[PDB]
Design a protein around this ligand. Structure first.
Ligand SMILES: NC(=O)c1ccc[n+]([C@@H]2O[C@H](COP(=O)([O-])OP(=O)(O)OC[C@H]3O[C@@H](n4cnc5c(N)ncnc54)[C@H](O)[C@@H]3O)[C@@H](O)[C@H]2O)c1
Ligand SMILES: CC(=O)N[C@H]1[C@@H](OP(=O)(O)OP(=O)(O)OC[C@H]2O[C@@H](n3ccc(=O)[nH]c3=O)[C@H](O)[C@@H]2O)O[C@H](CO)[C@@H](O)[C@@H]1O
Length: 303
């Protein structure tokens, strides 16, 4: 048992993770059914299984020591329109963890999200805070966590760790998320869309930092649940500001607010710091946005 399998491994976090592990000398399998088109063609990320997580089989796992489960439907606003489709997130986790148990896979990292906290009543938000999902997507991640929790309580393989990602951004991320949306809109429309008043706040972490942290989990005991966030929040307006510092001509296009909007996500990082320590560096928001925008600038206008 030596291979790493990454579900969602053609997508934004999973593709970067796959590339870093292959760059490190690891034997990597990516599993991804390409149900959303990847920004970056999958080439170079290892053996590729182009199927749903639900079609994973025993033999796909037979030499696998570690799984990163990152395959998800991940859109908060769209989950209000296709709520039943989001049940696939629960089905897939139930299937994956069942198969890992029957085969004896040693470790699984399960991707979850700060959205399971809803609007938390404790800021910064610690991992023991209760669950208050405000969308069908968030509800589906709560379901996925419940499945993983049962495996955590069971005294059988895999060791299962839940990672609650806060907002991750960077090159390669599709433009339905804030930073890339703003970039893609700034470039094709000279517009910076703001949904609602823009006072709502998110905790942003740059993709390379998140990948470094995920890799640090490959060779340490997994915490049952850990926040991956920066520990600081910024308003949508703060991000807008940073971009207009770059493009003063940009027009802010007011959009309609989201339903059940969350005013602030902010990670408590004490557990993260303890389990995986912290490195000096890390990409600040100014630089991260710039690197993201530059990446978008190297994309052909049609995009
Ligand atoms: N990006 C963030 O800002 C962020 C924040 C919090 C949580 N997360 C979580 O991180 C993970 C990865 O997010 P991302 O931004 O890379 O998304 P992504 O859309 O870029 O990648 C997910 C990949 O999974 C594939 N996929 C989805 N469902 C699948 C299924 N059941 N079977 C096979 N392939 C499937 C998609 O085709 C895609 O390439 C998800 O678990 C997501 O919920 C991401
Ligand atoms: C698409 C995506 O990656 N979603 C992830 C993102 O959700 P989340 O919904 O926070 O991410 P978004 O980037 O979609 O939205 C962030 C904020 O910016 C606003 N907005 C967005 C786009 C825009 O062009 N203008 C604008 O003002 C939104 O209303 C929201 O208030 O982080 C979550 C953790 O918190 C994850 O669970 C989600 O999977």
């Amino acid at each position: 048992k030596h291979r790493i399998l990454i579900t969602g491994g053609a997508g934004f976090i999973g593709g970067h993770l796959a590339r870093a592990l292959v760059a490190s000398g690891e034997e990597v399998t990516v599993l991804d059914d390409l149900r959303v088109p990847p920004m970056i063609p999958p080439e170079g990320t290892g053996k590729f299984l182009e199927k749903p997580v639900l079609e994973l089989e025993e033999r796909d796992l037979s030499d696998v020591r570690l799984v990163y489960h990152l395959a998800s439907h991940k859109s908060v606003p769209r989950s209000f329109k296709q709520p039943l489709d989001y049940l696939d997130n629960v089905d897939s986790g139930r299937h994956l963890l069942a198969l890992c148990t029957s085969v004896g896979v040693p470790k699984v990292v399960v991707g979850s999200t700060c959205e399971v906290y809803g609007q938390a009543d404790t800021l910064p938000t610690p991992e023991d805070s209760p669950l208050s999902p405000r969308s069908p997507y968030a509800a589906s991640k709560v379901g996925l966590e419940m499945v993983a929790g049962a495996h955590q309580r069971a005294s059988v393989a895999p060791e299962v760790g839940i990672v609650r990602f806060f907002n991750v951004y960077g090159p390669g991320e599709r433009p339905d998320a804030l930073v890339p949306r703003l970039c893609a809109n700034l470039l094709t429309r000279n517009e910076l869309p703001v949904e609602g008043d823009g006072e709502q706040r998110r905790d942003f972490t740059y993709i390379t930092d998140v990948v470094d942290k995920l890799v640090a989990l490959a060779n340490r005991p997994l915490p049952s649940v850990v926040n991956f966030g920066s520990g600081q929040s910024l308003s949508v307006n703060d991000v807008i500001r940073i971009l207009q510092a770059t493009s003063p001509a940009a027009e802010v296009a007011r959009k309609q607010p989201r339903p059940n909007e969350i005013t602030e996500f902010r990670a408590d990082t004490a557990l993260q710091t303890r389990q995986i320590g912290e490195r000096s560096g890390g990409i600040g928001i100014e630089e991260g946005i710039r690197l993201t925008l530059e990446w978008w600038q190297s994309r052909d206008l049609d995009d």
